[PDB]
Structure formats: C-alpha cells, structure tokens
Amino acid sequence: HSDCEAAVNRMLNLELYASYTYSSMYAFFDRDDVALHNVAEFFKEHSHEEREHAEKFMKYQNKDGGRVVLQDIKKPERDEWGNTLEAMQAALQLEKTVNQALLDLHKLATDKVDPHLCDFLESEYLEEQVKDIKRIGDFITNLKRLGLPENGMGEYLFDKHSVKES
Amino acid sequence: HSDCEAAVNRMLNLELYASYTYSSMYAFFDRDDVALHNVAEFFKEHSHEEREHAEKFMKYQNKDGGRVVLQDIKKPERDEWGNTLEAMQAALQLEKTVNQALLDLHKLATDKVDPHLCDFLESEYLEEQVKDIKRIGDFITNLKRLGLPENGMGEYLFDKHSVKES
Amino acid sequence: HSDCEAAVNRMLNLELYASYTYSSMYAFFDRDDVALHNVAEFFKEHSHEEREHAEKFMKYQNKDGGRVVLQDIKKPERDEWGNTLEAMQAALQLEKTVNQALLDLHKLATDKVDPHLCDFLESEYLEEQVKDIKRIGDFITNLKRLGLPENGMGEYLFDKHSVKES
Amino acid sequence: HSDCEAAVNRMLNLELYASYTYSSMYAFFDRDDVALHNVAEFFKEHSHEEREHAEKFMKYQNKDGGRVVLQDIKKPERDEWGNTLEAMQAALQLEKTVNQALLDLHKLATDKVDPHLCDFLESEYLEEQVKDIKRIGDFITNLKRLGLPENGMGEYLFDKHSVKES
Amino acid sequence: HSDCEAAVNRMLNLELYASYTYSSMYAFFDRDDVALHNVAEFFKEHSHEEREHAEKFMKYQNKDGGRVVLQDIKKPERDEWGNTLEAMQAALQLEKTVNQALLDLHKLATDKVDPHLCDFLESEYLEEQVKDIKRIGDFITNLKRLGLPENGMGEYLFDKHSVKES
Amino acid sequence: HSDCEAAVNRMLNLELYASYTYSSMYAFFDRDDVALHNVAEFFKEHSHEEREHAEKFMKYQNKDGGRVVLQDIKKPERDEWGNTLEAMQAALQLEKTVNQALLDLHKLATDKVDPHLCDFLESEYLEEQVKDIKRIGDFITNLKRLGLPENGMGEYLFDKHSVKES
Numbered sequence: 001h002s003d004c005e006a007a008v009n010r011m012l013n014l015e016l017y018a019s020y021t022y023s024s025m026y027a028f029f030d031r032d033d034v035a036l037h038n039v040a041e042f043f044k045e046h047s048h049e050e051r052e053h054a055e056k057f058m059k060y061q062n063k064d065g066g067r068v069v070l071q072d073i074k075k076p077e078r079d080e081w082g083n084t085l086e087a088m089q090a091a092l093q094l095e096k097t098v099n100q101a102l103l104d105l106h107k108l109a110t111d112k113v114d115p116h117l118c119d120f121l122e123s124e125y126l127e128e129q130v131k132d133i134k135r136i137g138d139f140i141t142n143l144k145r146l147g148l149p150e151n152g153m154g155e156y157l158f159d160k161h162s163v164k165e166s
Numbered sequence: 167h168s169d170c171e172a173a174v175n176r177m178l179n180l181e182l183y184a185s186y187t188y189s190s191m192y193a194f195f196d197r198d199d200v201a202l203h204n205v206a207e208f209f210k211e212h213s214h215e216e217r218e219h220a221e222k223f224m225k226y227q228n229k230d231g232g233r234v235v236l237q238d239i240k241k242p243e244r245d246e247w248g249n250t251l252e253a254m255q256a257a258l259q260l261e262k263t264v265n266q267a268l269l270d271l272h273k274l275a276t277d278k279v280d281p282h283l284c285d286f287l288e289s290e291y292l293e294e295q296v297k298d299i300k301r302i303g304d305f306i307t308n309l310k311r312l313g314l315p316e317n318g319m320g321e322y323l324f325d326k327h328s329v330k331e332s
Numbered sequence: 333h334s335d336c337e338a339a340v341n342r343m344l345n346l347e348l349y350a351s352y353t354y355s356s357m358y359a360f361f362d363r364d365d366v367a368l369h370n371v372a373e374f375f376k377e378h379s380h381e382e383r384e385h386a387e388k389f390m391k392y393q394n395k396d397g398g399r400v401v402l403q404d405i406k407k408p409e410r411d412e413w414g415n416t417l418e419a420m421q422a423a424l425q426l427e428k429t430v431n432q433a434l435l436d437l438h439k440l441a442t443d444k445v446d447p448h449l450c451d452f453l454e455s456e457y458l459e460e461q462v463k464d465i466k467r468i469g470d471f472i473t474n475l476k477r478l479g480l481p482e483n484g485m486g487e488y489l490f491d492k493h494s495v496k497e498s
Numbered sequence: 499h500s501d502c503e504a505a506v507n508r509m510l511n512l513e514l515y516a517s518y519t520y521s522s523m524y525a526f527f528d529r530d531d532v533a534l535h536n537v538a539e540f541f542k543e544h545s546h547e548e549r550e551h552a553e554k555f556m557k558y559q560n561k562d563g564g565r566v567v568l569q570d571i572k573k574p575e576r577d578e579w580g581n582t583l584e585a586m587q588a589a590l591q592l593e594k595t596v597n598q599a600l601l602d603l604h605k606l607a608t609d610k611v612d613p614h615l616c617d618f619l620e621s622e623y624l625e626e627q628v629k630d631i632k633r634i635g636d637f638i639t640n641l642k643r644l645g646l647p648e649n650g651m652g653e654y655l656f657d658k659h660s661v662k663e664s
Numbered sequence: 665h666s667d668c669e670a671a672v673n674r675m676l677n678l679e680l681y682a683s684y685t686y687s688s689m690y691a692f693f694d695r696d697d698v699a700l701h702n703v704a705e706f707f708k709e710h711s712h713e714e715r716e717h718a719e720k721f722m723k724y725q726n727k728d729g730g731r732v733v734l735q736d737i738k739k740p741e742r743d744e745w746g747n748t749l750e751a752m753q754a755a756l757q758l759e760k761t762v763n764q765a766l767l768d769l770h771k772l773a774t775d776k777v778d779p780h781l782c783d784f785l786e787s788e789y790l791e792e793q794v795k796d797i798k799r800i801g802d803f804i805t806n807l808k809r810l811g812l813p814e815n816g817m818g819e820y821l822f823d824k825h826s827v828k829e830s
Numbered sequence: 831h832s833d834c835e836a837a838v839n840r841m842l843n844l845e846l847y848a849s850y851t852y853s854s855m856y857a858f859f860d861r862d863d864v865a866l867h868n869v870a871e872f873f874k875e876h877s878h879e880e881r882e883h884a885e886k887f888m889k890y891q892n893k894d895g896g897r898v899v900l901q902d903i904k905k906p907e908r909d910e911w912g913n914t915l916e917a918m919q920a921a922l923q924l925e926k927t928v929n930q931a932l933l934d935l936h937k938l939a940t941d942k943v944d945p946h947l948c949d950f951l952e953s954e955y956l957e958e959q960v961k962d963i964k965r966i967g968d969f970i971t972n973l974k975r976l977g978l979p980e981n982g983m984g985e986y987l988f989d990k991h992s993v994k995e996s
C-alpha cells in the first residue's frame with residue numbers, strides 16, 4: 001500500500017519493458033536483410049542487463065517487506081528499427097526514459113526519507129545509466145561521422161570496429 | 167505472411183509468458199512470509215530456461231527468413247501462489263499448456279511439410295518438456311506425501327531435500 | 333560538544349548493547365538443557381559482527397576529530413530466551429531498534445549537512461541491517477511453519493538445516 | 499545457586515570490564531592529538547584477548563552445568579589516558595586486579611574441592627596473566643628510561659620499537 | 665552554461681592547484697640543504713593523487729555531457745616550505761580548502777537535485793579527504809611531540825619512521 | 831641566480847604547459863560529440879610523458895644545487911581542438927616549440943661550458959623530441975591522405991588503426 005512500494009513495482013515493469021525493446025533490436029539486426037551481427041549482439045547484451053536490473057528490484061522489494069506486483073510487459077514501440085543510427089537514437093531515448101524514472105524514484109525516496117532506497121538507486125542504477133547514455137551518445141556521434149544513414153560502408157565498418165566482436 | 171511464421175511468433179510469446187509466470191513464482195517464494203528460498207531459486211532457473219527457449223525461436227525465425235513480431239507479455243494469472251503444492255500444480259499446468267502449443271506447432275509443420283521445423287521442435291523442445299513435466303509431477307506426488315498443504319514441516323523438508331540447495 | 337558527535341557515541345553504545353544481547357542468546361543455546369549448537373553459533377557470529385560495528389564507529393569518531401566517550405554496556409533484557417522462535421523474535425526487534433537508531437542518526441546528519449556521515453551510514457550500516465532483518469524474518473516464518481514453540485522436532489530440524497553447521 | 503557458579507559469573511564480568519578498558523585505551527591512542535597507532539593497536543589486541551577470555555568462562559559455565567548470568571559492563575574509570583606511561587601503569591593495575599580475582603577464584607575452587615576448575619584456571623588463565631604483567635612491567639621500565647612523560651621523542655620511539663608495527 | 669558544470673570546472677582547477685603545491689613541497693624536501701627524501705616522496709605521491717582526482721572530474725564532466733573548460737594553474741603560495749612541520753601544517757590547510765570546496769559542490773548538487781553528482785563526491789572524494797586530513801593531523805601531532813621545529817634529530821627520525829621508505 | 835638555473839625553471843614551466851595542453855586535447859576527444867577515444871588516450875599519454883619530463887628537470891635542478899622556482903601553468907591556447915587533423919597540427923607546433931626551447935637551453939649550456947647539462951638534454955630530451963615530431967608528422971600526412979577534415983569515415987578509421995587501441 002506504500003507509494004515507494006508501488007513506485008518500485010512500476011520501475012521493475014519499466015526495466016522489463018526496456019529489456020524487451022532491446023530484445024527486439026537484437027532480432028532486427030539478426031535478420032537476413034539487415035545482418036549486422038555485432039550490433040545485434042550489443043543489443044542482446046543490453047536486453048540481458050535490463051532483465052538483471054528488473055530482478056534486482058524484485059529482490060529489493062522483498063527485502064524491504066513489500067510485495068512484487070507484476071503487470072503486462074508492453075511490446076516495443078516499433079517492429080523494425082531502420083538502421084544502426086535509428087536504433088541507437090531510440091536506445092538513447094529509452095535509456096533517458098529509464099534514467100528519468102530512476103531519478104523520479106529517487107525524489108520520491110528523498111521525500112519519504114528512505115536513505116536506503118536512495119543509496120540503492122545511487123549505488124546500483126544511476127552511474128550505470130550515466131555510462132550507458134555516454135556510450136550510446138558516443139556511438140551516435142560516430143554513426144553520424146560515418147555518414148549514416150546513407151553510407152552503408154560506414155554502417156558496415158561501425159559493426160566491425162565500434163561494438164565488440166561476437 | 168506464412169502460417170508457420172505466425173505460429174512461431176505465437177510460440178515465442180508463450181515462452182516469454184511462461185518465463186514471466188515462473189519469475190512471479192520466484193518472487194513469491196522469496197517473500198519474508200513465505201521464505202522457501204530453494205523453491206524460489208528452482209522457479210528462477212525455470213524462468214531463465216523459458217527465456218532461453220524464447221530466444222531460440224527468435225533465432226530460428228530469422229534463420230528461416232521469417233520476421234520476429236512481438237506482442238505484449240501478459241502478466242501471470244495469479245499474484246500470489248499459495249504454497250509449494252499449489253505453485254507446483256500451476257507449473258505442471260503451465261508446462262502442459264506449453265507442451266500442447268509445441269505439439270500443435272509440430273502438427274502445423276507436418277501439414278506444411280516442413281521437416282526442418284519438425285526436427286527443431288523434436289530436438290530442442292519436446293524431450294525437455296517431457297523431462298520438466300515428469301519432474302514437476304514427481305514433486306507434486308512428494309508434496310502430497312509430505313502432507314501439503316497442512317503440514318508445514320513437510321513443506322520445510324521439501325525445500326531442503328527435493329530442490330537443489332541455492 | 334557536537335550533536336553528531338554525541339549521537340555517534342550513543343550509536344556505538346547501542347551496537348555494544350546489541351552485541352551483548354547476542355552473546356547472551358549464544359550462552360543460552362549452549363546450555364545443556366537447551367543444546368541447539370548451530371543456533372548458538374549463529375548468535376555468537378552476530379555478537380562478533382555488532383562488536384565490529386561498534387569499533388567502526390570508534391574509528392569514524394576519531395577520523396572525524398571527535399572524542400569517543402563510553403558509557404556502561406547495559407545487560408540484556410532477559411536472562412533466558414525461551415526457545416529458537418522467541419529468541420529470533422527478540423533478535424528481530426533488536427535489529428529494528430538498531431536500524432531505527434541508524435536512521436535517526438542519518439536524519440541528524442542530513443539536518444547538520446554532513447554528507448560524509450550520511451554516506452558512512454548508507455555504505456557501511458543501512459544495507460547490512462536490511463539483510464539481517466530479512467534473514468531473521470525469514471527464520472521466524474520458518475520457525476512458525478515448523479510448529480514452534482510446541483514442535484520440538486521442528487526446532488531440532490531448524491538447527492540442522494536453517495543455520496550453518498558449526 | 500553454587501558459590502563457584504556465581505564466582506565464575508563475576509569473573510566473566512570482570513574480563514568483559516577489562517576488555518572495555520582496553521578498548522578505551524585503543525580509542526584514546528587513535529585520537530588525532532594523541533596519534534600513537536602502534537600503542538593503539540597493542541591495546542586493541544589486548545581488548546580482543548580479554549573478550550576471548552570472557553567467552554571461555556561462558557563455555558566453562560555451560561559445560562559445568564551452571565548458568566551464565568550477565569550484569570552491566572561498567573565503563574572504564576577514565577575517559578582519557580594521559581600518555582603511554584600512564585596508560586601502561588593503568589594496564590598493569592588492571593592486569594593485577596584480574597590476576598587477584600583469578601587467584602581468589604582458585605582459592606574458592608580449592609576450598610570447594612573442584613580440581614577441574616583449579617586446572618582450568620592454571621592451564622588457561624594464570625600463566626597468560628603472569629606473561630602480560632611481565633610484558634607491561636618491562637614496558638613501564640622502558641618508558642621511564644625513555645624519559646616519559648616529558649620526553650616526547652622517547653614516547654615516539656617506544657611506539658616504533660617496543661610494540662609491534664600495525 | 666550549467667551552475668554544476670562551472671562548479672565542476674572550478675573544482676578540477678583546484679585539484680590541479682593542490683597537485684602543484686604538493687609538487688612544490690616535493691621539490692623543496694629534495695633540496696640538498698633540506699634533504700628529507702621520505703618526506704619529499706610523500707608529497708610527490710600526494711601530488712600524483714591530486715592530479716588523478718582532477719582527471720576524474722574531467723571524465724565526470726564529459727560523461728555528464730558538460731564541457732571541460734580549463735583555467736591557469738596558479739603557482740603555490742610559497743616558494744619554500746620551512747621544515748616538515750610547516751609543510752604539514754600547510755598541507756593540512758590545503759586539504760581542508762579542497763574538502764570545503766568538495767562540500768560546497770555537494771551542497772550545490774543537493775540544491776540542483778543531482779543525486780548522481782552527490783554520490784560521485786561521496787563515493788570518490790569525501791572519504792579520501794577525511795583519511796588525508798586525519799593522517800596529516802596525526803603527523804602534525806607527532807612532529808610537535810618530536811620537538812619541531814627546533815629538534816633536528818626529531819625531524820630526521822620522523823622521515824625514517826612516519827613516512828614510508830622511498 | 832645562475833642563467834642556466836633560471837633557464838631550467840623556464841623549461842620545467844614549458845613542459846608543464848605542454849602537458850596541460852595535451853590534457854586539454856584528451857578532454858576534447860573524450861567529449862560525447864567528438865568521441866574519438868583512441869585519439870583521446872594518445873593525447874592523455876603525451877600529457878603524462880610531458881609531466882614526467884617536468885619532474886626530471888626538478889630533479890636535475892636539485893642535483894645541480896639550484897632551486898626549483900615555479901610559475902603559473904598557463905591554460906592552453908584553445909578550448910576546443912576542431913578535429914584530429916587540427917589537433918595533430920597544434921601538437922606538432924607544440925612539440926616544435928618545446929624542441930626549440932630545449933635547443934636554446936643547449937646553446938646556453940654550451941656557452942656556459944656545462945657539458946653535464948648538454949649531455950642531460952641530449953640523452954634525456956632531444957631524441958625523444960625528434961621521435962615525437964616524426965610520429966606526429968607521419969599522422970598529419972595520413973590524416974591528409976584520409977581526407978580530413980571533410981572525410982569523417984577517414985577520421986573514424988584513423989582512430990582505429992593509427993593510434994593504439996585503448
């Protein structure tokens with residue numbers, strides 16, 4: 001019946017949503033008419049990370065004596081992702097949406113005088129999110145430099161050099 | 167536009183649904199007023215397996231030249247799972263529901279003369295499912311023998327002996 | 333002459349009090365007419381942890397340029413602890429009492445604009461306390477399930493399975 | 499209801515008292531305006547030893563079929579310890595006070611024809627105490643030789659050479 | 665154009681200033697008419713630490729999407745440092761000046777509702793600074809005890825025993 | 831009061847200036863809208879080298895019986911560096927400026943009949959500088975060949991192939 005308790009359930013749902021969107025990006029880049037497998041695997045890894053982030057909120061809820069209450073995991077906003085630049089731009093926005101949600105949870109915890117929840121967020125979530133935003137930003141800058149979307153050689157090269165070989 | 171292609175997308179959605187239900191069972195058994203941690207971890211492992219099973223269907227779809235099309239992952243049917251017997255009975259039914267879906271996909275593949283899809287299902291899915299159904303059945307029999315739901319000592323003992331220590 | 337300085341001295345005293353209560357629980361479970369040695373050793377380990385927590389506050393005080401000022405360590409509230417359920421219920425309440433004291437120190441540090449002290453508490457104390465509260469809660473639930481206090485077989489079994497073998 | 503049983507409880511209380519005094523000496527020497535860290539760590543180790551000596555009496559009481567009965571642990575006689583010479587002189591007196599208590603327990607055990615308790619004391623306590631008294635005596639002689647309290651160079655040197663480096 | 669962004673640039677400049685002052689202290693103690701090489705190396709290590717602390721703020725600025733803007737690194741306040749006591753007293757004041765700047769940045773971040781920056785400071789800066797202040801304080805106390813500035817034997821001994829051998 | 835002594839102090843200041851400029855180039859290439867991390871790390875390494883070169887002059891001054899006298903470290907000439915070609919061209923000019931200063935010091939040492947200083951410069955500085963000038967020259971030629979500044983694919987490729995992976 002707690003506002004933080006409900007907020008955490010919402011946050012867990014959002015992490016699950018983010019994981020599913022990344023999974024969609026993985027599937028797209030794996031397609032035979034897309035076929036950027038390093039880019040695919042980058043998004044697969046991000047999907048697994050976000051699911052791990054959801055499971056951490058489940059654990060926190062239970063340690064906190066709250067109840068985990070699950071809702072539908074909504075499908076991603078798109079069925080196809082265009083190319084590496086468009087997908088990275090959507091990822092950036094997704095990470096920012098998750099970041100603002102985290103920051104909103106932190107403001108709630110602050111108002112509710114819940115320093116344990118403030119620390120949890122600061123220690124387990126906020127800096128990972130700053131890192132992911134920076135790295136995706138950096139990728140977008142490079143994709144622009146490489147001439148996306150028009151420059152297919154540049155897109156091919158990004159897949160080889162910018163993302164780890166899978 | 168393929169019937170097998172759509173069927174595979176449906177199957178992938180069902181695997182994701184099954185994974186989410188298991189995740190719910192994990193969260194429940196982790197609760198401070200439930201507190202059967204081996205049972206919790208058993209269901210967590212099943213959730214991870216079902217997600218892996220979804221990802222295999224994504225890979226198959228793409229290798230097949232189909233398109234992965236995602237839908238909402240519906241929340242589990244219950245928010246709380248009663249006890250170890252009730253949760254295992256629900257797991258049994260979930261596994262049977264997934265099994266019948268797999269078998270229905272197999273009948274479709276058979277009609278569509280798709281031996282590759284028939285083999286995929288037979289080699290990667292059907293026997294795992296027979297194993298999971300047997301093991302859950304066996305657990306139910308033991309939980310009954312142990313006096314569930316009334317016998318809380320028996321439920322405690324099941325957690326110690328029947329499921330691997332986490 | 334600082335309010336945080338005095339508060340820290342009080343907190344150190346409380347940690348020492350908590351350690352002593354745990355030591356009493358250890359001694360009780362070691363008795364020849366109690367004789368639950370795993371349960372005894374669980375409480376002995378908690379006593380050593382709380383003493384370590386007191387010593388950390390001494391170190392903090394000194395690094396902070398404050399003065400460690402000691403008071404009497406009051407004897408535990410009880411001379412005998414009933415059984416494993418009663419002892420765990422008292423431990424739960426003790427952990428909650430220490431937790432509220434920590435949280436009160438944190439509110440003081442927050443008012444006094446002492447982020448270093450806020451971090452200390454958040455990084456070294458608050459999450460350990462959430463863990464201990466969860467684990468004791470979980471034990472109480474299990475002890476209830478096992479039929480305590482009446483079910484001596486259940487109490488025997490708890491000692492074997494729930495607490496680490498000493 | 500035993501005289502030896504009560505005597506042991508008193509002895510355990512005294513060991514706990516001695517440990518707490520040593521802990522106070524540790525805290526003092528750690529202070530930023532005292533800052534003799536080897537001397538601090540020497541007294542910290544003595545505090546841990548005395549606590550171990552208390553726990554041995556708890557074990558003995560329980561093996562003996564007696565009951566451990568705890569009382570308040572009184573705060574040390576001083577809040578500040580002067581310097582290394584004054585602290586060592588107080589330690590010497592504390593060790594002698596504990597030694598006389600042990601010897602008094604031994605006389606009681608002798609009167610009560612309790613050779614097991616006599617052996618316990620002789621084998622686990624009396625010789626450790628002779629060693630500690632000798633070593634502190636030896637330190638006092640050296641601190642005098644070094645010109646304490648006036649000779650701060652001598653006090654600095656004692657910390658470097660006489661007590662183990664921490 | 666951010667107040668935190670400018671504040672971080674100022675903080676980075678101050679860290680660079682602190683590093684340069686330490687470098688000056690290193691050079692002084694290396695002189696043939698000063699010749700306290702352990703003391704020299706202590707200040708050299710502190711200079712390298714402060715430069716590392718500046719580079720961390722550059723990294724933070726960039727991850728934060730701000731711009732690193734550099735200003736002149738002002739020369740140290742003194743060209744010569746007297747002796748080990750005077751140098752340590754100046755170091756103490758320098759560390760306190762850096763600490764107050766950090767704490768002021770933290771107050772700004774708090775007002776601007778920037779918990780990520782609050783955590784950064786608390787996790788990477790504030791406790792290191794408490795440690796450095798304590799250790800220098802402790803050194804000053806010892807240098808006083810050793811008879812500085814008049815007691816050149818004491819100063820020689822400090823170099824041998826208090827600071828690590830280089 | 832020596833001309834070589836003052837000259838060395840000037841030289842040390844210039845090395846510190848050069849290190850700071852390189853640090854600025856590092857920060858620029860790390861930016862989210864620049865994002866050439868290998869190029870960033872190349873300039874970071876050059877900054878650390880130049881600081882090491884300053885510290886060597888401090889050591890030389892002191893061994894020589896001179897006094898290290900520090901001045902302000904002036905901020906770099908630019909706040910932003912354009913792109914990899916512009917930054918390399920500025921680095922080339924910076925290295926040449928340091929080289930001419932070294933050569934001027936050498937002429938002074940030669941006039942002052944200071945073969946030890948001549949050797950120092952020849953053995954520790956002049957050949958490193960010839961190497962750095964060659965390597966930066968070579969980079970400029972390649973950046974031109976790659977089509978800088980207009981060819982962003984070429985700039986991306988330079989970062990991958992020409993500078994070591996960080």
Ligand SMILES: [Cl-]
Nearest residue numbers: 002003006007
């Ligand atoms: Cl709400």
Ligand SMILES: [Cl-]
Nearest residue numbers: 002003004112
């Ligand atoms: Cl709330």
Ligand SMILES: [Cl-]
Nearest residue numbers: 009010013071
């Ligand atoms: Cl939701």
Ligand SMILES: [Cl-]
Nearest residue numbers: 049052053056
């Ligand atoms: Cl995680």
Ligand SMILES: [Cl-]
Nearest residue numbers: 077078079080
């Ligand atoms: Cl779409």
Ligand SMILES: [Cl-]
Nearest residue numbers: 096097099100
């Ligand atoms: Cl954001």
Ligand SMILES: [Cl-]
Nearest residue numbers: 138139142162
């Ligand atoms: Cl890149």
Ligand SMILES: [Cl-]
Nearest residue numbers: 168169172173
């Ligand atoms: Cl269909």
Ligand SMILES: [Cl-]
Nearest residue numbers: 168169170278
């Ligand atoms: Cl078909």
Ligand SMILES: [Cl-]
Nearest residue numbers: 175176179237
């Ligand atoms: Cl579906």
Ligand SMILES: [Cl-]
Nearest residue numbers: 215218219222
């Ligand atoms: Cl699988």
Ligand SMILES: [Cl-]
Nearest residue numbers: 243244245246
């Ligand atoms: Cl329900």
Ligand SMILES: [Cl-]
Nearest residue numbers: 262263265266
């Ligand atoms: Cl079935």
Ligand SMILES: [Cl-]
Nearest residue numbers: 304305308328
């Ligand atoms: Cl079984």
Ligand SMILES: [Cl-]
Nearest residue numbers: 334335338339
């Ligand atoms: Cl107060």
Ligand SMILES: [Cl-]
Nearest residue numbers: 334335336444
């Ligand atoms: Cl205060």
